[PDB]
Design a protein around this ligand. Structure first.
Ligand SMILES: [Br-]
Ligand SMILES: [Br-]
Ligand SMILES: [Br-]
Ligand SMILES: [Br-]
Ligand SMILES: [Br-]
Ligand SMILES: [Br-]
Ligand SMILES: [Br-]
Ligand SMILES: [Br-]
Ligand SMILES: [Br-]
Ligand SMILES: [Br-]
Ligand SMILES: [Br-]
Ligand SMILES: [Br-]
Ligand SMILES: [Br-]
Ligand SMILES: [Br-]
Ligand code: NA
Ligand SMILES: [Pt+2]
Length: 129
């Protein structure tokens, strides 16, 4: 599923991401924009053999099981495929674990390089929230 901007903002809010670990909704929407362009089915293979999955490009080295990332863990206790669903529940639940891991949203390299410190409220501007 390719979400609209305000559609995804509303779904992220429903699932409790607005201000989660202190990160306003606009941060999460911005992260999703640059990670997946709002596409739940996005995947990206990394050089280390791991793969990133879904709207927030969550990685198989620590967070999900894809059966092909040697030495990896599955801390969200899910198949990585769950992260590609039109229903963002698994991605949101797992993101909450990631952002609590100590480095905050810096865990998303695209958030750090493209969202951090910017006017992130622009990402939710106009939306019925
Ligand atoms: Br779609
Ligand atoms: Br957009
Ligand atoms: Br929109
Ligand atoms: Br919704
Ligand atoms: Br919910
Ligand atoms: Br915001
Ligand atoms: Br594996
Ligand atoms: Br293994
Ligand atoms: Br594990
Ligand atoms: Br599994
Ligand atoms: Br949803
Ligand atoms: Br959720
Ligand atoms: Br879940
Ligand atoms: Br933080
Ligand atoms: Na894994
Ligand atoms: Pt939820």
């Amino acid at each position: 599923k390719v979400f609209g901007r305000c559609e995804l903002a509303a779904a992220m809010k429903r699932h409790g991401l607005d201000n989660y670990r202190g990160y306003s909704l606009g941060n999460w929407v911005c992260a999703a924009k640059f990670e997946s362009n709002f596409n739940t089915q996005a995947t990206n293979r990394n050089t280390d053999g791991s793969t990133d999955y879904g709207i927030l490009q969550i990685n198989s080295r620590w967070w999900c099981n894809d059966g092909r990332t040697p030495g990896s863990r599955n801390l969200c206790n899910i198949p990585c495929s769950a992260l590609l669903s039109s229903d963002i529940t698994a991605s949101v639940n797992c993101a909450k674990k990631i952002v609590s891991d100590g480095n905050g949203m810096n865990a998303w390299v695209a958030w750090r390089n493209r969202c951090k410190g910017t006017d992130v409220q622009a990402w939710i501007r106009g939306c019925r929230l």
